[PDB]
Amino acid sequence: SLFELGKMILQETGKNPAKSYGAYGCNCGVLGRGKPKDATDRCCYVHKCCYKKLTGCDPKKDRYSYSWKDKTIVCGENNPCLKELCECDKAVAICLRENLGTYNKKYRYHLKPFCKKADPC
Amino acid sequence: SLFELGKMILQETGKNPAKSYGAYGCNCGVLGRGKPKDATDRCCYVHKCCYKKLTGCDPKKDRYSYSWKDKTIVCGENNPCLKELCECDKAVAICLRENLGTYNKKYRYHLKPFCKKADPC
Structure with a gap:
């Protein structure tokens, strides 16, 4: 979730x-x-395309288990959807850290109507 | 939506x-x-309970038609769910404005464990 x-x-x-x-x-x-x-925005782009592939669980409200092991996110879920869901969130979080160097606050609270339409995933 | x-x-x-x-x-x-x-937080509480009452449509994704007439939000739906959903959104938007007077920025990014159990809708 x-x-x-x-x-x-x-x-x-x-x-x-x-x-x-x-x-x-x-x-x-x-x-x-x-x-x-x-780059930061693109992490979330990939993240939402990752969500699209999920079936059988709710990425917003369904909670799932993972552990913080060797300072690494280790998804601990047998259930395929939850496990994939975990890996989606793990990917974006890793992606966001990797691109924190170009994070720009000017993009915070950016308005949707001034976003061009996305290509399909 | x-x-x-x-x-x-x-x-x-x-x-x-x-x-x-x-x-x-x-x-x-x-x-x-x-x-x-x-009070501002209460607007969103009511809004979420408002959503909970809806049967037949999805609050987050289902688009509906409304207009800005004489600086008033005017819903434009006959379908009960889309109508009620529109009014749900209309009411919270109005509520938020009517409570800007006690809006307090310290409640931004409020830490969830400081939240007590909500009353039932």
Whole structure:
């Protein structure tokens, strides 16, 4: 769920997930995707395409288990959808840390109508 | 959808809905409900209970038609669910404006474990 997603982002980035990534660019936050503004936004773009592949679970509300082992997110779920879901959130959190170097606050609270439509995943 | 909701909030409050309400208190822009921290937070509590009453449509994704007539949000649906959904979103947008007077930025990115159990809808 968003709880695990936010927690992972916190663990990887060190950043408050809601403030930094609850509404950034065209892909991080509510609504769907859009043409990404930067690398950080593209992580969320990939993340939402990753969500699309999931069936049998709810990426927003369904909680799942993972552990923080050797400072690495280790998804601990047998159930395929939850396991894939975990790996989706793990990927974006890793991706966000990797591109924190070009994070730009100007993209926070970016408005959707000023995002160009996304290509399909 | 969340797009129409966001637009209403902007139209009513004049505020970027993400910055002001994307994470406020225990009910605004956060997963689940919690005891409202203030009046603005209470708007979002009511809004989520409002959503819960809906049968037949999806609050987050289902688009609906409304208009801005004489600086008033005017829903434009006959379908009961889409109509009620629109009114749900309309009411929270208005509620948020009517409570800007006690809006407090300390409730932004509010820590969930400070939230007590919400009353039932």
